[PDB]
Amino acid sequence: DKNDLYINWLKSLSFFQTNSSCAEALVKVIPHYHNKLIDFSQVLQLVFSASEKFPIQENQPLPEQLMFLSNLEKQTPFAKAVGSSIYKLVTGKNLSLDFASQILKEASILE
Amino acid sequence: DLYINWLKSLSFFQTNSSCAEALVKVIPHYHNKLIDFSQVLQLVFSASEKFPIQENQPLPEQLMFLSNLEKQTPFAKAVGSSIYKLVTGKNLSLDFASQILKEASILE
Fold this sequence. Notes:
The structure is a homodimer. By secondary structure, chain A is mostly helical. Chain A has helices at residues 2-12, 14-17, 20-34, 40-48, 62-72, 77-93, 97-110. The first copy, chain A, has one domain (1-111): Histone Acetyltransferase, Chain A. The first copy, chain A, is 73% helix and 0% strand. Chain A is globular and about 40 Å long. Chain A binds chain B through residues 25, 28-29, 32, 35, 37-38, 41-42, 45-46, 49-50, 88-89, 91-93, and chain B through 55-59, 62-63, 66, 69-70, 77, 81, 84-85, 88-89. Chain B: It is found in: Nucleus; Cytoplasm, Cytoskeleton, Microtubule organizing center, Spindle pole body.
């Protein structure tokens, strides 16, 4: 059931709903989840890797990133997994940290 | 036990001193039936330390790897799914992962 819940929560994230590419990615990714080749954390990473729409900020400050990670450690399961997967976009694609915090806050609320 | 023999023959296993050491510690529990082969793979590969890494790898290639993995033979699929955890969690290079999978497929 919670396997379904996590999927429903993911689909409910504003970030997911503003990125049709993420919805398209989930369609192709989810079978491997149902077939148990990958876990939900992996689904989140794959799906978010397909995102195209989000604010960008290059060379973001270290202190804020460290505070983001300290806060991430305290999150509930789904929220923590969402946070870690979105942080991959912060470091690798310059996704704005403030935006990442909004997504994480939304995930925590859904959970 | 074939799966254990094949695991010991994988280049990725042999080139990772931590994996070889891990199997020594883990296998008794496998022989005593406390854990299955999939768990042996998870415990052993989780100890891996050496492998090429690449951040934010492209989804299309990821999906191709997974579609191939789904059609694999038992040992190869088990190995591939375990290695894929390293692809996503530690950035192990997908091309390297495909190499390991091909070796496993040949051994089996």
